[PDB]
From a paper:
[name], a type I transmembrane protein, is conserved across all Apicomplexans and its knockdown has been shown to markedly reduce invasion. Recently, Toxoplasma sporozoites were subjected to detailed transcriptomic and proteomic analyses. It was found that, in addition to the well-characterized “generic” [name] and [name], sporozoites also express two paralogues dubbed sporoAMA1 and sporoRON2, respectively, that are not expressed at detectable levels in tachyzoites or bradyzoites. To better understand the mutually exclusive nature of the interaction between the sporozoite and generic [name]/[name] pairings, we set out to solve the crystal structure of apo sporoAMA1 and of sporoAMA1 bound to a portion of sporoRON2-D3 (sD3). The results presented here demonstrate that invasion of Toxoplasma sporozoites depends on the interaction of two previously uncharacterized proteins, sporoRON2 and sporoAMA1.
The co-structure of sporoAMA1 with sporoRON2-D3 reveals significant complementarity, with a buried surface area of 3274 Å2, 23 intermolecular hydrogen bonds, and a complexation significance score of 1.00 indicating physiological relevance. SporoRON2-D3 is integrated into the apical groove of sporoAMA1 through an N-terminal α-helix seated in the area exposed by displacement of the domain II loop and connecting coil ordered through the center of the groove to the disulfide-bound beta hairpin loop at the opposite end of the apical surface. Nearly three quarters of the hydrogen bonds formed between sporoAMA1 and sporoRON2-D3 are found within the cysteine loop region, and only the strictly backbone interactions are observed at the generic [name]-generic RON2sp interface, which contains approximately half the number of hydrogen bonds observed for generic [name] and the generic [name] cysteine loop. Firstly, sporoRON2 Met1009 buries into a deep cleft in the side of sporoAMA1, while the corresponding residue in generic [name] is Gly1307 and there is no cleft in this region of generic [name] due to the presence of Met233. Secondly, beta-hairpin loop 3 is four residues shorter in sporoAMA1 than generic [name], which together with the introduction of a glutamic acid residue in this loop (sporoAMA1 Glu132), presents an enlarged pocket with sufficient shape and charge complementarity to accommodate an extended lysine residue of sporoRON2 (sporoRON2 Lys1010). Finally, the flattened surface caused by the presence of groove-central Ser252 in sporoAMA1 readily accommodates a bowed out conformation of sporoRON2-D3 consisting of Ile1012 and Glu1013, whereas the corresponding central residue in generic [name], Tyr230, limits the accessible area in this region and can only accommodate a valine (Val1311) flipped down towards the base of the groove and held in position by Pro1310. The C-terminus of sporoRON2-D3, for example, does not extend the length of the groove as observed in the generic [name]-RON2sp co-structure, but rather exits the groove shortly after the disulfide of the beta hairpin loop.
Residue numbers in the entry:
A (entry chain A): 96 to 364, 383 to 476
B (entry chain B): 999 to 1028
Amino acid sequence: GQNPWATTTAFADFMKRFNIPQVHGSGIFVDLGRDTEGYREVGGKCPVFGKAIQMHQPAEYSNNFLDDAPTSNDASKKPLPGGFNNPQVYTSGQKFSPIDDSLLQERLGTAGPKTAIGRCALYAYSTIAVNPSTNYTSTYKYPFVYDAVSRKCYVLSVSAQLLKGEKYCSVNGTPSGLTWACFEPVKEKSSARALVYGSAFVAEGNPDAWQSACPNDAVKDALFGKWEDGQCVPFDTKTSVQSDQATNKEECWKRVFANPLVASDAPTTSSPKSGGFGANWANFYLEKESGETICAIFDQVPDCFAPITGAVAYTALGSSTEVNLPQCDSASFIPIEGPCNNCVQVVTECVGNQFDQTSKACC
Amino acid sequence: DIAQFLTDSGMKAIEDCSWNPIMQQMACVV
């Protein structure tokens, strides 16, 4: 009765992704983990799946945050129209952002990162801000957003992620007068765009590391838990921050991102740094008690997975797409041969941490 | 002012240009 999630390479490697403070190390909801040159900087190590900025510019405004950010601070404009995408142009006459992922690979080549996310993070990281006058450079780096549908890399020029309150922003034209319109992050699952928001520091070191290293996906048929008395005990709704009923599985996914205790670096009332600590993990499951589905947000770092049919364990960082647990460790797992009946037996192996049963004939 | 709070929300006034070694061009605000 040792814990295989701590013990075994296949299981450990997986469970490691679900220490957010260690693998991400910053606010998720708002990521303002670093500071540079007297500013706040998006710093988090893991990329964030489904994150987008909802805006509250008036209806006439396009209200997309991937729009070219407002180019010349306009007087007759209040609030200031546009989005967050860097609006600069190359000498070529080509827009700095967004860029195709195609364009990236050709120019990046073999030496460059494999993942397109890696590739786009590196675009952002690669970028140096310069003053044409007084030739001056900055080490300040901006967050990228990657659209997985269309395969475009956007570099933003707006590290802000949340703006709230009528002293500072306008909701829906009101109070008119104010330059900035309110915005807040939201996990969104359109079929038309598929966004991933990240720090440019995903690209620092090895840009493809997230893939192996981060809680990128939702897990199907499993529940976060601590390991007690030789077995994995699902965090129960009693030590959860909130465990309200939740209509469906995708609803739980959005709730974790937004819930009021999720790791977040936004200013209270002052540059708060969460280090990733907060209600970031949630269990979705059907209560055996009056059978109402529950979304169970926790702040406890799980160290194992309790497997259960039809369950889903989500995190504030990860995708909405479900994915299997590892069933075995290739390295350690001895192939087991079932009883030879009919001169044929099923034989079970561990190709890529999953059971492939392939039936063989003993005689 | 209040804009103490806006910098403290991640707001930063960009610089006119960028250099990118992947494209090896200078991109500037039009």
